[PDB]
Amino acid sequence: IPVIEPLFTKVTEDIPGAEGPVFDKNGDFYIVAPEVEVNGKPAGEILRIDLKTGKKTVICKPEVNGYGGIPAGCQCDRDANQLFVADMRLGLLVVQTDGTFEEIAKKDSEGRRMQGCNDCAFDYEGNLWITAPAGEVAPADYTRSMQEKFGSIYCFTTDGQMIQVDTAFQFPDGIAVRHMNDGRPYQLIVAETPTKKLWSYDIKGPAKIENKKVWGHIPGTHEGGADGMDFDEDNNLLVANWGSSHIEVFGPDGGQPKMRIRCPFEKPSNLHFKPQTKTIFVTEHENNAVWKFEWQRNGKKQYCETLKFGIF
Numbered sequence: 001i002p003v004i005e006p007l008f009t010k011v012t013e014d015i016p017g018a019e020g021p022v023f024d025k026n027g028d029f030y031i032v033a034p035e036v037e038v039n040g041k042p043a044g045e046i047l048r049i050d051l052k053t054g055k056k057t058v059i060c061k062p063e064v065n066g067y068g069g070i071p072a073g074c075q076c077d078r079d080a081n082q083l084f085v086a087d088m089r090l091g092l093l094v095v096q097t098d099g100t101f102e103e104i105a106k107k108d109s110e111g112r113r114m115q116g117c118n119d120c121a122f123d124y125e126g127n128l129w130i131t132a133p134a135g136e137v138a139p140a141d142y143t144r145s146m147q148e149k150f151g152s153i154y155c156f157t158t159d160g161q162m163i164q165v166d167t168a169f170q171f172p173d174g175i176a177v178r179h180m181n182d183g184r185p186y187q188l189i190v191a192e193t194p195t196k197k198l199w200s201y202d203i204k205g206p207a208k209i210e211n212k213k214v215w216g217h218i219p220g221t222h223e224g225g226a227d228g229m230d231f232d233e234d235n236n237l238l239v240a241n242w243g244s245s246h247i248e249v250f251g252p253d254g255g256q257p258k259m260r261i262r263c264p265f266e267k268p269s270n271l272h273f274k275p276q277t278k279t280i281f282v283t284e285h286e287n288n289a290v291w292k293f294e295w296q297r298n299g300k301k302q303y304c305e306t307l308k309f310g311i312f
């Protein structure tokens, strides 16, 4: 498989478990530090990074009834400048730029206790697809589906339902939505980390997925596997392969990667394009740091970059 070796430029440092890179509607850049702990208990953080200086500001250190969060992944909303954050202890949070936040769900649409979440992806219809590799949210004792298949997938819909849409994954992690050129969502891709697979479904409608399939194969026998992912503007899927020192690039039909991108570190965890550029910001756990590099083309627009009131 062809491998390219772009120049990685350091962005910021010392972010425990650096994850969830995201740009808001003002172009501000955020990351989460899920692994910050106080007295051995979770005290994860959501940070804003000043791209000019690399200086970090913690805007939110979420805790619910004394249970601190493990915020792990993010998406920016479209209609309001607020971040939806998947948290391994707290489930799904909505966080404002002022640092205030709310916890969205203690239970799902069927009254089942909510599971801790890892990453999420808005489709263009505004529905939010979320991976949930942890067990029940706080105050339940923390567990994760790395050994046993209890990880779930949710769709948090525009009408505010938190719908469990699949179950029994061994650590579902990255997630992405592919759209038709006319903007209709039609495929969901979900990383199952340790099994070295990417799974696909057909999106039939809000919270409606069918035709589960093993869509892609992640290279390697290292400990780790697919972590975060995102599409570029031609619908190639770029996937951080934690432990492999590469980001894998899959073409629109999946299968094996068509190209790999060598990183100067073994553990890329997640990535995000900066809007209107070819720049991909990458979080990684070898150094607990953030970097950026130039890809071959622009990212596929995120939901936050689209317009509610477009004409075209």
Ligand SMILES: [Ca+2]
Residues within 6 Å of the ligand: 019, 072, 073, 118, 119, 173, 174, 227, 228, 269, 270
């Ligand atoms: Ca992740």
Ligand SMILES: [Ca+2]
Residues within 6 Å of the ligand: 021, 228, 229, 230, 270, 271, 272, 273
């Ligand atoms: Ca991303």
